[PDB]
Ligand binder design. Sequence first.
Ligand SMILES: [Mg+2]
Ligand SMILES: [Mg+2]
Ligand SMILES: [Mg+2]
Ligand SMILES: [Mg+2]
Ligand SMILES: [Mg+2]
Lengths: 233, 203, 241, 220, 196, 246, 246
Amino acid sequence: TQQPIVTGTSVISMKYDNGVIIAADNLGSYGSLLRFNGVERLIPVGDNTVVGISGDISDMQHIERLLKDLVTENAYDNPLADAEEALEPSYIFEYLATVMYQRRSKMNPLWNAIIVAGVQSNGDQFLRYVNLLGVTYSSPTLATGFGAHMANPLLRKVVDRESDIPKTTVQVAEEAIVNAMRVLYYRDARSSRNFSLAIIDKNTGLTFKKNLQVENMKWDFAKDIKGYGTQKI
Amino acid sequence: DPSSINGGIVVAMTGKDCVAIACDLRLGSQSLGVSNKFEKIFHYGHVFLGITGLATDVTTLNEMFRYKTNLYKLKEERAIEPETFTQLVSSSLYERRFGPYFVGPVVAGINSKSGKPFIAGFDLIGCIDEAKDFIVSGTASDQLFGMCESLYEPNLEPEDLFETISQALLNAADRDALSGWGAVVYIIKKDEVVKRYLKMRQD
Amino acid sequence: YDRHITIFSPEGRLYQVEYAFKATNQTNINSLAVRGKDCTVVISQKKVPDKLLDPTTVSYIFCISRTIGMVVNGPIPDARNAALRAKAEAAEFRYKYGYDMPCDVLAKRMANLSQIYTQRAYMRPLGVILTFVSVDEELGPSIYKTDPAGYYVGYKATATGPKQQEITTNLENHFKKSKIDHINEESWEKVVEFAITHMIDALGTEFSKNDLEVGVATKDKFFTLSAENIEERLVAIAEQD
Amino acid sequence: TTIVGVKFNNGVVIAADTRSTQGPIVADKNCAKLHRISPKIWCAGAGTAADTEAVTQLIGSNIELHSLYTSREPRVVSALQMLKQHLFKYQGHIGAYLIVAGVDPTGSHLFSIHAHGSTDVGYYLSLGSGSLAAMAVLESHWKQDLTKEEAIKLASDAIQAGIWNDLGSGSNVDVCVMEIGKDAEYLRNYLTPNVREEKQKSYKFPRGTTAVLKESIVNI
Amino acid sequence: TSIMAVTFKDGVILGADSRTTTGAYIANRVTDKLTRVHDKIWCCRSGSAADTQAIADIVQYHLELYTSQYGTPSTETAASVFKELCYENKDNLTAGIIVAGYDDKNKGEVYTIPLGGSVHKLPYAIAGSGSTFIYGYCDKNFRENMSKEETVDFIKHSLSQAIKWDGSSGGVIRMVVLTAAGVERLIFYPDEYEQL
Amino acid sequence: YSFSLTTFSPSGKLGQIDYALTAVKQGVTSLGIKATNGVVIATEKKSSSPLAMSETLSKVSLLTPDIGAVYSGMGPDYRVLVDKSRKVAHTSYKRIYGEYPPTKLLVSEVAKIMQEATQSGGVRPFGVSLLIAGHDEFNGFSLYQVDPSGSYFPWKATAIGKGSVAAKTFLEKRWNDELELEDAIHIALLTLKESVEGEFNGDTIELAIIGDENPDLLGYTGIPTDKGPRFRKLTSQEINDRLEAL
Amino acid sequence: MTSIGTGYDLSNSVFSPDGRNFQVEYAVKAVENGTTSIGIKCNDGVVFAVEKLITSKLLVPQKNVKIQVVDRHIGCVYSGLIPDGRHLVNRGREEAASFKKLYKTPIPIPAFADRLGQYVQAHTLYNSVRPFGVSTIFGGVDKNGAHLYMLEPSGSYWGYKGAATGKGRQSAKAELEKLVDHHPEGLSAREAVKQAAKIIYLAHEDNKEKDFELEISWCSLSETNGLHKFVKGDLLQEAIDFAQKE
Ligand SMILES: [Mg+2]
Ligand SMILES: [Mg+2]
Ligand SMILES: [Mg+2]
Ligand SMILES: [Mg+2]
Ligand SMILES: [Mg+2]
C-alpha cells in the first residue's frame, strides 16, 4: 500500500497480574468521513492471542486472512494443534514482524500498526508491537497512533514499571482501558463511541467483549462556555 | 527537442508523369553549422526517401531501409514500389511507438506499373500523409507549407516543376536559421532521373 | 518407437492414436445425439453395478457453458480432463470476443488440441470421443463430434460406443424414410422420448430410469435431467397398459 | 477532428471531417478518417493519428483471422472487446479515440471507445475536438426511427458544425452507410463545401529562374 | 456518479444516475452503471469508467468459469473476486464498486468495495461523488425489510437528492430489481424524480 | 524428446518424411489445373458417415482473397496448417506492407512450417501435401504443391493422393497452354470422375477457382481501387450444373 | 489380463493395442498391498477408518497418524505407497487454499474431488512421471451436505455411500454392502463410527498375522460442526469395544 484509504485509529493495551487487555474502536474512516461503524479491529487467534490492528482497513483484512491461514496450516498433521503444539502469541508475532519488515523492504508496506496480545503456554503475558516499518517493541502498555499520545500516559499511571504488573488486577486494568477509550473519544476526531475489548487471562482464557459504548461523559460545563474572549451571552 | 538539434528540410512534389524531391545540405549542432554536404535524400531501386530530423536517425533509417528493401528484392524478385515502401516505412516507425526515431520521412517515386507519380509524408511514429500535391518536412516546414500552397499548381512539366520546388525550398530555407547551406533537387521521370545542386545563400 | 509415441509407422499410420480409439470403448456404454426443430438431445447409457456407488455422481455428460453440452465416450479421467479444458476455452472465448462460443468452434478448437497430441511425442492422446451439442445462435441445433485423431465433423445425428453401428443404421433408416435431417418436434421431451425409443430398439434392451442419463440443449441453455424426469420420459413411451 | 455516429431504422451511419493538423498547421486538407475493420464494420478516429490507424489495422487483421477461423461474419462486439482490452492494457498510452459502427448477423451496432479502454453505446455519438459542435446539432435534430437518408443528413450536418465552428476540423464530409442486409456504402467526399477559389495569378517561373551549381544524371 | 444498492424483504435493488463526465462536459447522459456479472449478481460502478468496465468484465469471466466448474457462485464469492482485483491492483485503479445479489437463503446481499479494495457487507450502501450529499438522508430513511415499492421510493428519493446537489450526477435514474421472481429493470425520468 | 525424431538412415533417406508421404499417397485424390485466365483446385468429399454433414467441413480453404489450398493426407494436419498459413500471411506480410503476400512467398512460408516439423525436437512431420492456387499482380496465376518435407514445385497441372498416377496421366493428355478456366474446370471434373468411387455430384465434390476479381464478394462499395477477391468456391448447385451437361 | 502387457507396459502414458495403460494397472497392484482403509457416508457427515499394522512393538502407539486433514473440513485416507499419499494431500492443500483465496467460501467437496482427479490423471499423461501408488478415500461437509469419494491411480473417482481400498477391501466392501441394505433410512455419525471400527476389524483378518491399531476420523454437521476431527477418547473406545464383540 502506497497510501491508506479506509482507516482505523488507536489500538490500546496493557498487562495486568494474570494476563493482558486490548481494545480498539469499531470505526473505519475514509478521510474525514466517518464511513463504517461495525468494523472489528481485534483479531483473536486461537484461545490465547488477540491481534489488534490500526491503519489501512484493506491491509487489515489481508492480515486477518494471513492469520486464519496460519491457524489452518498449523493444524495439518498436528495431533496436538489444540494443545502443546497450538500457536503461541510469540509465533504469531514473529511471523507478522517478519512479514511487515519484508513488505517495508520491498517498498510496498502493509500500512498498519499492530499490537499482539496474549498469554504464552508458561503463563507469561505477551505484549508486543509491530508497524509498517517493521519497527517492534514491548512495554507494559502499548498504544498505536493517537492512543500512543493520550492512552499511554494514562495507562502508565497504573503500570509504570515491571513490578506494577503483579499488583494490577483485571478489574483495575479494565477500568484504566475504558477510561482511556473515553478520553480518546473526547479528543481524537477520528474516534467512535463504540468499541471492542478483549482480555486474555492465564486462568479464564479469552473474554471478547463486543459493542461497548463510551459512557459517563462530562459535557455539562459546556453550557457556560460562551464566545471566545469578550462575548458575555 | 531532438528534431531541431541538427536542422534541415525536405520537400516533395508531383508533376505531369514526374515527381520531384529536394533537400538542404546543412548539418549543424544548434547554432554551429558543421557539415555543408549532409544530403537527406536516399533511394532504393526507383523509390526515393527524404528524411529530416535527428541526423543519427536519418542515417540509421537509411541503412535500415536499404537492408529491408534489399531483402524484399531478393525474396520478391522485383524492386519495391513507392506504395509498398510507404507502408513499410510506416510500420517500421510504429514498431518504435514508445521510443521513436526523431524523423520526418518523405517518400517520392513513380510506380513502375501504373506510371503514376506518388508521394507521402510521415510523422515520427508512422502516420501517413497520403496527400498527392506536395509534402514538406523539417525545421522550416511552416515556411515550406506557405511556399508550396502559393507556388504550386498541378500537372507541371518536369522543367517547370524544377523551378517551383527549387523556389519553394530556397525561399523557405532563407527564413530558417537551422536550414539551408546548399540544396539538391531530383527530377524523377520514368526513364530519367536528374540530380541538381542549387546555388543559395551561405548564411 | 512407433508403437509407443505418435510417430509414423512405415505404412504412414499412428498406432498410439489407433490404440487411443480402442480406449474409448472401455466403459462399454453407448451414446447418441439427435437434433430437434429447436433443441438438441444427447443420451447415454449409465451402468452403475456396484451398489456402494452414488449413482448421482456418475456422469459422462458435462455442461461446458450455458449453451454447450458435451457427452464423452471413454474413461472418466480423460473425459474430465477434456471437459475442464473445453469449459476454460469457452469462458476465454466469451471474454476475448464478446459473444458465446459456438459449438462447432469449440469442437474445432478441441480437435486442434487433439491433433497436437498426435504430432508431439511427449503428450499422449486422450482416449476419448467428445460429442458437442447446442442450439447455436446462427446455425440452430448442432452436433459436432471430435476424436483422438483430431478429426471432427458436424452431424445430422450420431452415435458412439461398442454398438454404434447398430444405432447409426437405426438412425440412417429413419432419416431416409423421413426426408428431413432432424426430428420434427418442438417439445424437447418428445425429442428425448424419440431418442430413448430408438436406442431401446437398436440395443435390444429396455431401460429403467437408472440405466441412462440425458442432456438437452435449447436456445436458452443446456441442461441435464434428474432420474425423476427421465422416469417421466420412460412412462411417456411405455407401451403396456 | 469531428467524427459522429448515427443509428437509423435499418442500420448505422458514420461520418468524419477531412482535416489533419500538425499543431495549428493543416498537413492534409483531404485526409481519410473513415477506416474499415472488416467489410461491414467501419470506424472513425480522433486523438493520436498513428495510434488510431495502427490499432485499426491490428484489430482488423485479428477480426479477419477470427472470422476465417470461426467461419463467421465478424461481429462489432468482437472489435469492441479486442480494442478496449488492448487499449486498457496500454493504460491510456495508445491515444486512440474511436467511434465504431457496423452491421453483423446480430443486427446493427454503434459504440465509442476512449484511450483508457472505456466504451459507450447509443443511437448517436461524437468524438474529437469538434464533438461539442457536432453534439449540439445531434441533440437538436435527432429523433428515433430515422430513415437512411435522414441519418445521413443529420450526421452530415453534425460534421459540418465542427467543420465550421471547430478550428481542429475542416474541409470535406465523408460518410459510410452500413445497412442491414446490404453492402456497406462508403461515400468519400460526400460533401466538398471548401474548394479553394482560383488564385489571382500563376506563379510558374520562367525556366532558368533558379541558379544551379552542378547537374548530373542518376542511374536507377 | 450516484450509486446505491438496498437490501429489502424480497431481495435487493440497485440504483444509479446515468451521467458520465469528462471535465464539465457530459460525455454520456444515459450511461448504464448497473452491470451484470452473473444472473442474480450485479454491481454498481463509480470511478474510472475504463477501470470499472475492465474489472466487471474480468469478474464476469471468473464467475462464468466458476459456474461451469463448481456450480452457482454466491454473492459473497462475487464480492471476493472483485475485492481481490481491486485490492491487488489498488495502485492502478480508481474503482468504487457496490456488489449486490439475490439467493434463496440470504435473500438480498450488498457488499461495498471502496477505493483500496477493502470489502464491507451492509444492509445498504451508497457511493460515488454524489453520495456525500445523501449520507444524512439515507441514514434517516432506511429501514430493514422494506417492501419492493417502499424500496424503489427510498432509492428514487435518495438518488433524486444526490443528482440535485452533485454536478457529477444526473440524467435518468436506473434501477435493477433482484428477487426470486427474477431480474427487473426500471427507469425514472427527470420530470418524475425532480418533483419529489 | 528434445531431439529430432526425423533422422537420417544409412541409405541417407529420412524415414519419417517417407512415411509422411505414404500417408499422403493414401489420402483421397485432389488435383490442380492452371489455365490462362485462372486456376482450379479440386478434391472429393468422402463422408465417413451418411449421418455426417460434409458441408460443415471444408477441404478447400481460402488463405488470402487471392490464394486457396486443397490437400491429400491427414485432414487434421491440414486444418492446422490452414490456421497457421492464414496467420503468417498477416504477421509476416500484410501487417508490414498492407498487402497480401504473393502466392509463391506464401507457399514459401508454409514450406518453412513443414520443414520445421521435420527437424525440430519432439515432433513428427505433417502428413499432408498441399496444392495451392493463387494470383498476384506481378506473377499472375500460379499453382504449387508442398510436400511433408517442405519441398515445393510449381505445376501447370498435377494430382496427389490415391488416384494420382492415373490422374496425372489423364492430365498430361488433356492439358495444353491455352485452356481457359472453363476448360480447366471441365477437365478437372472428368479427371476427378475416375478417382471417384461411389457417388459423384455437387455434394461429394469440392471445387474452387482463382479467377477474376469478384466486386460482389467485397462486402462494400466506394473504394473503386479496391479489388474484389479472386478466390471463389463453387456451390453444390454450380457443380451439378456442369455435371449434367458434362 | 494378459495381466502383463509385454512391450506396452514399460513406460507410463503408452496405450496398449487394446487401449489400456498397463503402468496405471500396475500402480493398482501396489494399492492392493496396502492396509485397509474405508469411508462411510452418514446422515449429516462422513467417517474414515484405517488399519494400521503394528510391524514391531518398537512402533510407538498412537503415533504415525495416517488420516490427514485438508483445509478444515476435508479428511483423506489412502492405501498403498503412503508417501504418494502425502504428496497428493500436499497438492490438495494448495488447491483448497487457492480456491478459498479467490472465492472466499471453503472448497466444495465435488470441486475438491476434481482438483485431485485432474492432478492424478495428469500423472498418466507423460512418461517422465509414474502414476500415484495410492487409492484415496476422502470427503466432508459442504453447503450441499455430506460427500464421500474414492480416487484411483488412473485419476478415476466417483462419489460413494461407502468405500474400501487396500488389502482387505473385498471383506470390507461386503460389510459396507450389508450396511447399506440394512439402513435404507440412513446411518447416524456415531453409529457409522462404531460400524467403521467393526469393518476394519473384520478386514484385518487378511493381515491377521500382525497386530494392528485402529484410526478413525469424522466430519459431521451435528457432531463436529462440519469440521474434520479425529475420533478419540470414549467414543473411540466404545467403537473398539463394539467391534470386538462381533
Ligand atoms: Mg516541423
Ligand atoms: Mg536558412
Ligand atoms: Mg548564418
Ligand atoms: Mg503424442
Ligand atoms: Mg446533478
